[PDB]
């Protein structure tokens, strides 16, 4: 319903009021979250300049303040001593600038000399309203203030169309270098392109990372390379994959791909797995974004949000939420994802569980639930249920001979992109035991399966009185439910 | 340098730029509080609606979003599950009506059934701008959102000038009582007015409430009666108090005054101490405001900032915070304060200390260091301090024969309301031994003296790199020194 013009009219042409009276429908909103980052007011969508620099943690947000809709970008900033506890810091980039007229988007962060570099994509319309995308080293400093430059690092080059953006800017084997996704102007196919630098001033191209002869859909939104426990890690946002490649259902995927090996100046990569996996089963998971951090740990933060697609909480004038912080694993030949250490500080009000079929009749609106289920059984688990099971978040399990975890969110609220379906499979081992470790959070469920083999995440909208959590069988299983403190 | 016109400009006149401009500075200064509630832009001042209400805390606010200055007052909110870990809930009250057309003064909160009474002073200026302050009751729901009525509750009586503000409703004694800070209009004396009710509808005046024959100031704001250990106690700001009643060095004070009885109906004060007494002996509170809780507990917490007053940060366009959460006590015949004990969680990186000159070269800008100093000794102890100790904040202590303490911020940094002095005293008992409890959070510090029988709370600026701690003498005591986490 939002025109191009309401989408662009510049930020000082909003008033104040309407500025302040959004902040307190976002806030006060039945549906918010409160140990999830989530917008002050306003769309949040794609993390950006994840990273560790001056003593503490930092994220920055794809932002659109006022409304519940992709209106210009800019960055607004959070930091945290531990991943967990956030505290606002206010915008950081706006769209206030010819290089980034039409919007500040997504980019990452890199330490430089006692700085901060902010690498992103100024989103250019010009005179006719055609894309120019610029590739922007913006600054901070240890105060978090922000300085831009006037001129842009990488101009968009020949081969790419209008689609060349989301700049990772990072050091590794003694040099600098930029991942952007792209979409080749002749080919319309997407691909990382790989840009490499000995001094932040002049870059050289290296050409489109070798993914190999398949076609990774027609744009790559959001690419990110992590190393995680040694291997290469891709994680990245391939639109229109064909899912021969691999099965999603969600509108756009969020991928990623292990290496056994990289190499940035041969435009080289040697895949570990046969093929990328979804790195989230579940609904709403999308431009992930991840870094290397100090102690040695790769963390990822996820958008809970995807592009083109509605929700409930549309009328009340604000948008989605982030993810959890995840800490990555390779293990098996598989990218694991774990709750940071710092999220058990959240907890409060543990109950121990052993076999009851009614775990809570009224569990509140945040909470952890921590499941170990016996193979060879088949049910269903029932969350934010009201009491006759009819309307919930279903989790139907089978740890038997046709083992598979299905989440079906139909029943739970109102339809929620329902064009993309009301379920996810999450297939299982057949006869082994099954692990659960669940987030509630307002209109956010985060389900970590088999200690992070798997995580599903996705939003649901239900009756602020639904909070029953049940097994619908006699169900064996142990398990501890504990109540998480709010702090946003 | 800010005119009245610019002051009462309303919100919507502002623009939403400038709004995001402001949060960004404010959020990002080197001298902001990240473990106190502070502004998200502009000036914060008295606390309001302090309360337990729909399973968690409550705290709303005096605030102008828009600058350093006391423009058109609004209240924002927010909530906390332990009185430590608060998150912004927005706007609140807006001076958007006729009964609080310049302003939505302070006020508080009450629980009635099942809904949350915001009791507040509409800062009513009429065509004349003559104030005509309206006592009005509004009402906040679990989801925590407010509906004004159309009509005030209590009209101004004719005994009063038009100084007349911030309600405090309560239950007692089987009915409804307000207690309201009022200048009687002939002899421009400050008193508490007390009106009662048994349906919130129709409301009696009892009369001022007999606080003695010796003047309380010509005006009180903020009153509030809680009862602690079964004792009334008044927490009040009796503008223009004789010092002759009682020592202050503010421009001005937040007295208490402990009864051993009262009785509301017939608007008597037996007091329990002869004389009213600073509820700080700091440099900056002010408006403190106090409830009592479901837990049994009496909690107060203090606007940290003075009326017509000037800080260095009036540059950076915004002011002031709060103090931590106090939880109050009545022993020995004295108010006694204590941090919360949830304030623990944000302690880390714990040192012990024993005797040892230099606790810190460098102790960061957010730290809690607890003391226990042998008697018979003299020295300072600095904080925030350079490496020379020429700037500091210096804890001037003498535990021998002439028992005392000065606090002196003169060479912290830039000048803070120096017409009011740069030292505070507080007297101590010769040959006794002293604890100390201080909380630094960038420009803000909390002295806790003796376990709660003092608390000294005041701004400072200092650089950066002031961070040293240190005695100057060889002192014996033993101590701990734990960073605070940032959460705000
Ligand atoms: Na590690
Ligand atoms: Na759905
Ligand atoms: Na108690
Ligand atoms: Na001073």
Chains 1, 2 share one sequence.
Request: contains cysteine.
């Amino acid at each position: 319903e939002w025109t191009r013009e309401q989408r662009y009219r510049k930020y000082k042409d909003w008033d104040a009021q309407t500025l302040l009276d959004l902040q307190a429908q976002a806030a006060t909103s039945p549906y918010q979250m409160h140990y999830h980052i989530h917008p002050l007011s306003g769309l949040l969508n794609d993390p950006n300049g994840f990273s560790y620099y001056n003593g503490e943690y930092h994220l920055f947000c794809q932002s659109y303040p006022f409304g519940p809709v992709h209106g210009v970008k800019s960055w607004i900033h959070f930091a945290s001593p531990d991943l967990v506890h956030w505290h606002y810091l206010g915008p950081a980039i706006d769209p206030d600038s010819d290089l980034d007229n039409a919007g500040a988007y997504s980019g990452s962060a890199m330490e430089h000399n006692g700085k901060l570099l902010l690498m992103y994509t100024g989103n250019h319309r010009d005179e006719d309203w055609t894309r120019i995308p610029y590739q922007v080293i913006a600054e901070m400093d240890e105060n978090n203030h922000i300085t831009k430059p006037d001129a842009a690092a990488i101009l968009p080059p020949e081969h790419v169309s209008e689609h060349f953006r989301d700049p990772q800017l990072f050091k590794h084997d003694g040099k600098y270098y930029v991942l952007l996704g792209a979409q080749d102007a002749e080919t319309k196919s997407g691909h990382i392109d790989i840009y490499e630098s000995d001094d932040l001033k002049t870059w050289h191209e290296n050409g489109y990372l070798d993914l190999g002869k398949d076609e990774m859909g027609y744009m790559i939104e959001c690419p990110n390379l992590v190393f995680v426990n040694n291997y290469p890690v891709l994680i990245f946002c391939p639109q229109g994959l064909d899912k021969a490649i691999s099965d999603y259902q969600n509108i756009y995927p969020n991928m990623y791909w292990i290496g056994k090996d990289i190499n940035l100046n041969e435009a080289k990569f040697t895949p570990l797995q046969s093929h990328p996996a979804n790195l989230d089963d579940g609904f709403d998971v999308y431009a992930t974004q991840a870094f290397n951090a100090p102690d040695g740990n790769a963390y990822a933060i996820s958008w809970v949000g995807l592009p083109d697609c509605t929700y409930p909480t549309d009328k009340e004038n604000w948008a989605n939420c982030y993810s959890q912080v995840k800490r990555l694993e390779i293990k098996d030949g598989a990218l694991y994802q774990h709750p940071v250490d710092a999220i058990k500080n959240l907890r409060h009000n543990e109950t121990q569980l052993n076999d009851e079929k009614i775990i809570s009749q009224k569990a509140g609106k945040q909470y952890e639930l921590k499941l170990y289920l016996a193979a060879g059984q088949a049910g269903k688990l029932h969350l934010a249920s009201n009491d006759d099971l009819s309307a919930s978040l279903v989790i139907d399990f089978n740890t038997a001979q046709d083992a598979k975890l299905t989440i079906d969110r139909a029943s739970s609220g109102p339809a929620v992109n329902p064009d993309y379906g009301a379920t996810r499979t999450i297939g299982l081992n057949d006869n082994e035991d099954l692990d659960l470790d669940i987030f509630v959070d307002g209109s956010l469920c985060e389900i970590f399966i088999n200690d992070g083999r798997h995580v599903a995440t996705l939003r649901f909208f239900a009756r602020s009185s639904n909070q029953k959590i049940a097994f619908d069988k006699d169900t064996k299983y142990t398990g501890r439910l504990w109540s998480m403190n709010s702090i946003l």
